[PDB]
Amino acid sequence: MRPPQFTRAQWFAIQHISLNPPRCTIAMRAINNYRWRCKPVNTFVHEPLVDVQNVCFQEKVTCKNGQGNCYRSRFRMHITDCRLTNGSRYPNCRYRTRPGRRHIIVACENRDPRDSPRYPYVPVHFDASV
């Protein structure tokens, strides 16, 4: 679940934007610290923050949940898919790291008041890795 201390945009960035190349088992720890079971699957976008934010102005598409506020990246982006190993037992979560470069789809919305006023419309959910 989203920890209440983070806005939707903040949690999206924590889970899905990687400045440095992600090694899944290391990078997932900050996420699973807020959880009570290992996150089974998680995608990181390894691109500058502004490039990920800018997907919110690209190709508008229907979201998997039926909402209309999703967008598909114009270009393939560098991503890393993290999948929990079959032997992992919470709280010790290990991941397989599957890098790639694909179009992404994100949901976007107006910023929360607790989000930076410099980005009025921001990504809040990772919808798809293709």
Numbering used by the authors: 0 to 129
Text taken from the publication that reported this structure:
Based on the structure-function knowledge of the RNase A superfamily we have engineered a chimera that combines RNase 1 highest catalytic activity with RNase 3 unique antipathogen properties. Based on the RNase 1 scaffold we incorporated specific regions essential for RNase 3 unique anti-pathogen activities within the RNase A superfamily. The solved crystal structures confirmed that all the chimera proteins reproduce the kidney-shaped folding typical of the RNase A superfamily and thus keep the fold of the templates used in their design, as suggested by circular dichroism and molecular dynamics analysis. Nonetheless, the structures that incorporated the key features related to RNase 3 antimicrobial activity retained the overall RNase 1 active site conformation together with the essential structural elements for binding to the human ribonuclease inhibitor (RNHI), ensuring non-cytotoxicity.
Last, a third version was designed, where the flexible loop L1 of RNase 1 was removed. Last, removal of an RNase 1 flexible loop (L1) in the third version enhanced its antimicrobial properties and catalytic efficiency. Finally, RNase 3/1-v3 was crystallized in the presence of phosphate anions. The structure has two molecules in the asymmetric unit with an RMSD between backbone chains of 0.27 Å. The C terminal β-strand is conserved in this version, keeping the geometry of the B1 pocket. While in RNase 3/1-v3 there is an extended β-strand, in the first two chimeras the C-terminus end is disordered, determining significant changes at the B1 pocket. Interestingly, an equivalent distribution of PO4 anions is obtained in RNase 3/1-v3, where phosphate n° 3 is located at the active site. In the case of RNase 3/1-v3, the replacement of the flexible loop of RNase 1 by the shorter and more rigid loop of RNase 3 reduces the capacity of the first two helixes to readapt the active site configuration, provoking a major displacement of both helixes and forming a hydrophobic core similar to RNase 3 one. In contrast, RNase 3/1-v3, thanks to the absence of the extended and more flexible L1 loop of RNase 1, might have a reduced protein motion and hence a reduced catalytic efficiency. Although the hinge residue His48 identified in the RNase A scaffold to mediate the protein motion is present in the three variants, this residue in the latest variant cannot perform equivalent interactions due to the absence of R1-L1. Two additional variants were later designed, where variant 3 combined the best of both parental proteins, achieving similar antimicrobial properties to RNase 3.
